[PDB]
Paper text:
Similar to the maps for H2BK120ub nucleosome, the local resolution of the H2AK119ub nucleosome core, at ∼3 Å, was higher than for the conjugated ubiquitin, at ∼6 Å. However, the map resolution was sufficient to unambiguously orient ubiquitin within the EM maps. The ubiquitin in H2Aub position 2 sits at the nucleosome dyad bound to the nucleosomal DNA terminus, end-on, with the ubiquitin beta-sheet oriented towards the DNA. This ubiquitin position would be incompatible with a nucleosome embedded within a longer DNA duplex. The KD of RCC1 for nucleosomes containing H2AK119ub was measured by SPR to be 540 ± 90 nM, similar to the KD of RCC1 for unmodified nucleosomes.
Monoubiquitination of histones H2B-K120 (H2BK120ub) and H2A-K119 (H2AK119ub) play opposing roles in transcription regulation and chromatin compaction. Our results suggest a mechanism by which H2BK120ub serves as a gatekeeper to the acidic patch and point to distinct roles for histone H2AK119 and H2BK120 ubiquitination in regulating protein binding to nucleosomes.
Residue numbers in the entry:
A (entry chain H): 29 to 121
B (entry chain F): 25 to 102
C (entry chain E): 39 to 135
D (entry chain K): 1 to 73
E (entry chain G): 14 to 118
F (entry chain C): 16 to 118
G (entry chain D): 28 to 122
H (entry chain B): 20 to 102
Write the structure that this text describes.
DNA sequence: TCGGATGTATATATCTGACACGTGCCTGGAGACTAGGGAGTAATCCCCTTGGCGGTTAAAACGCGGGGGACAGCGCGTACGTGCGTTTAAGCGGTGCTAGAGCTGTCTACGACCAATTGAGCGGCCTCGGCACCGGGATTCTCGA
DNA sequence: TCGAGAATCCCGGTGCCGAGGCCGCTCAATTGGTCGTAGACAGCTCTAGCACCGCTTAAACGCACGTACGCGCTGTCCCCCGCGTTTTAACCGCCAAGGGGATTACTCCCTAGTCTCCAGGCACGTGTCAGATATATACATCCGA
């Protein structure tokens, strides 16, 4: 049956960054595993913190603090800047 | 301020481990190591209490920050 | 009279291994903690129990590190600890890069 | 009559002596057969120290005795 | 448009992340801004990794990326080594280093 | 009740409620809390028995955390289980390396 | 006047059952509270992860048994398994 | 069917090559045997986990994905085989 | 008859083996060892190829890391050749049993 | 200190199988609407933290004599690196086969929700003897002989 | 060995506060019942894991030979260690002030849930050119002079 993956999106990001480069299947599996692991870590930590503060729902602030706790400084602030930019762009329209 | 960790205190701490003949600049080395460790744990606790929307650091924040680093502590309700 | 070097050290080792109380004075540690936390946020208040927990954690960590340092020092056919032993132990532990 | 002497290295030395053998004589014997200068030796038998002008029998030293020496430096 | 991903101008899917978060049993009720934030973070990290890997492959005059390039890109960046200090990747290899006094005089 | 039906000491309803409210699964079985309570009771009974024996050795009638530390560190399976946890006011096992001792 | 629940009474009952004449200090009680909570959280998390990994939405006694067999070392694992199955059989025998 | 004397299959030159990857220059005579023990213990852990997973799935074939789970439990996550 | 000085071919092999990426241990002996080990826990088990491949990769990585730490300890101990005591010291410091 | 020899980086043809791309179709995602419960907001209490003063005494700081430890130079003999011929089992490659993994239908017992009820567990009070502190003597090492 | 000087453990008396117990109360666990579906069971098909045999050759094994390194011995120089005197600030006890952590009541609007529609992404299929293989050459480097 169907087997979900992260193919088209990673390929699109690669095309956006480097216009004339290609990658093999093993690198594809490695990137898929890396994305899944990062997703699992961030989501688990955010949910844990949300129940830690006795709150019954998860919101953008929880993920912001999870990113601040997980990633070290410089790329953490880069990622939070990207996230805020995306959030305001989405809510504007 | 960091000087406040007195040399005889370091000597006692090492004597608990079981060292015999202390020598050199292990005092300065220990001070640096302690500073780094405190910096990390304090940053984690401060982030926790920042999200909590409070102005007083509580024991739960410190216990939980120690829990994150795989250094679980027993005996403070955590 | 006078004692030969190396006996009072052993007596202190036994005495401190038998007991269970802290060895760092409370007030300088509290001042250091407040000064360190001053940078990250201004006008912060600390409960006493948090400072106590931090003190205990620091004591345990330092004791373990000194254990490993002693092991390395006796390994190279010496008796005195020097900083290179601390660096080696920290590097093998996986803490330092 | 023969005596055994115990050192700090765990080696026992067997020496033939007589009760008239003064401490000068026995110390000379140790120096001759072991090469140790006389000034480096202290002798204890039955827990007592000795004065060089005496003789062996003055400390009631019998045969087959065990006398301990200490190196002084 | 219609898709939520185009609304935020992102490439990673928003609806898929929302569905995974809802069905992953993390909280009883999930917010509405969380998927956008998470997708943006994932996109940024993937872009960084891919750019570093592409540069590493460029240095070796090969137009295709193999796992060795990913290993070199990850291990040659200090922070990225920090983030993945307990992760191994197949066929990666090891960095070419030698101790000092081991070398001939 | 339900603890009486199984001859347990730890509560069963409390464990059931914590499992249900702990967002672990959509639904829970009717046998899991009993098993979990039995395991918890066994572990705590082992720890307490060891700590009490250690306190008996020192000729005291009340358990203080040092007795718990000694009981945990002396056993080897229990030490393996609690490998990355520190106990407040615990102490250190009294060992000394062979070389350091005088001749 | 918050109703903070704990495990003090049950630990005291177990201690009295095992050792008749022995008392316990408050710090030891807090230590036992923390230890029990940590072990409970570990076992529940592992069992839930396994159940979700096998794409089944119901957590039963078998998942708990497997999690116990995973986390604890040999001797304690076998003893806990025996105690658990004995308790389950005793509970299901009656009604 | 019973199998035996497989530990000796790890040949000495292969161990020498593995050491040479890590950056070693000289090799003592007595190291090899020692190493042949350590590796064994490693395997004796991870397989013990993997089989248990196959026990819970009610199967008879050990899958690589179970090995990935077992390696993940010990905090040595591995990338390249899914999950 | 040319004869290279000791340590030169060793260095050349060092560079060669750090350059490449393929695995080192052969296939059939490893597969037989894995089957023999798994026989004890439960009889009549069947293995997938990718499982054996992953086990081999993990084992090689772990062994290489251990050897690197052993070399670090040996060079610290003012020697050039590694000895088993260095291996057990590295294992002890890492926290393994 | 050179010079012969050897390993290595580079230049070049080439053929293949893995990668990039077009197609059809199926299911999960988007649009419009409801409703109700969780979260933000305002006001009040009183509890724990901050701040400071006095004193006392224990610990900290400083200086000195010396001996035991760290480190460098030297000799040795033994264990390991390198080369070569012989022996051996890993690896490639086609063939048979079936046990067992994976998907499909069924129906059934097991668990979620809900109304009524009552007693198990928690907050508050009080009481005492096990443990902390102090004075005293027997015991056991430890350095100079 | 050994004997005297301290350091330590064992013994006995005294006082005080934390633990064990008792009492009163409130909300969560029990009981009885209905209704829906997660999964156990039985079956069917199709793949890949096991066993097999033959041929090739690259890899492993055993043996000589030589030399560089681990190890023990020795000598020197100096850096902490034990001890006594002067200096200081930690801690205990006490008192004042007040900020904000914790509750309680009220209001609103944000997300789960419903249905209907349709287009994004999946397996399938196919063509082709980037890299591995094999070959040939010039450059860098190493050990005897």
């Amino acid at each position: 049956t169907r087997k979900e993956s992260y193919a088209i999106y990673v390929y699109k990001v690669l095309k956006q960054v480097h216009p004339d480069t290609g990658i093999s299947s093993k690198a594809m599996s490695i990137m898929n595993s890396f994305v899944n692991d990062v997703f699992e870590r961030i989501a688990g930590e955010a949910s844990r913190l949300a129940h830690y503060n006795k709150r019954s729902t998860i919101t953008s602030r929880e993920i912001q603090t999870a990113v601040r706790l997980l990633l070290p400084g410089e790329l953490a602030k880069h990622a939070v800047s990207e996230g805020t930019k995306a959030v305001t762009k989405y809510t504007s329209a | 301020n960091i000087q406040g960790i007195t040399k005889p205190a370091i000597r006692r701490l090492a004597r608990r481990g079981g060292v015999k003949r202390i020598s050199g600049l292990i005092y300065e080395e220990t001070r640096g190591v302690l500073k780094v460790f405190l910096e990390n744990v304090i940053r984690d606790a401060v982030t926790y209490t920042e999200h909590a929307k409070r102005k007083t650091v509580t024991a739960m924040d410190v216990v939980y920050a120690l829990k994150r680093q795989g250094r679980t502590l027993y005996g403070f309700g955590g | 009279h006078r004692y030969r070097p190396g006996t009072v050290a052993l007596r202190e080792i036994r005495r401190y291994q038998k007991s269970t109380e802290l060895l760092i004075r409370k007030l300088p540690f509290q001042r250091l903690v407040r000064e360190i936390a001053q940078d990250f946020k201004t006008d912060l208040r600390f409960q006493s129990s948090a400072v106590m927990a931090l003190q205990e954690a620091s004591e345990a960590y330092l004791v373990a590190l000194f254990e490993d340092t002693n092991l390395c020092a006796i390994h190279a056919k010496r008796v005195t600890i020097m900083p290179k032993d601390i660096q080696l132990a920290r590097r093998i532990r996986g803490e330092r890069a | 009559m023969q005596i055994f002497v115990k050192t700090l290295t765990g080696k026992t030395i067997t020496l033939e002596v007589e009760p008239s053998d003064t401490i000068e004589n026995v110390k000379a014997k140790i120096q001759d057969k072991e090469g140790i200068p006389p000034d480096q030796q202290r002798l204890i038998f039955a827990g007592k120290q000795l004065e060089d002008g005496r003789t062996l029998s003055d400390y009631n030293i019998q045969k087959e005795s065990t006398l301990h020496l200490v190196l002084r430096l | 448009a219609k898709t939520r991903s185009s609304r935020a101008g992102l490439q990673f899917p928003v609806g898929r992340v929302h569905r995974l978060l809802r069905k992953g049993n993390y909280a009883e009720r999930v917010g509405a801004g969380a998927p956008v934030y998470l997708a943006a973070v994932l996109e940024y990290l993937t872009a960084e990794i891919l750019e570093l890997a592409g540069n590493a492959a460029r240095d070796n005059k090969k137009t295709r990326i193999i796992p060795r390039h990913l290993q070199l890109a990850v291990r040659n960046d200090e922070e990225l080594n920090k983030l993945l200090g307990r992760v191994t990747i197949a066929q990666g290899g090891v960095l070419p280093n030698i101790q000092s006094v081991l070398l001939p005089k």
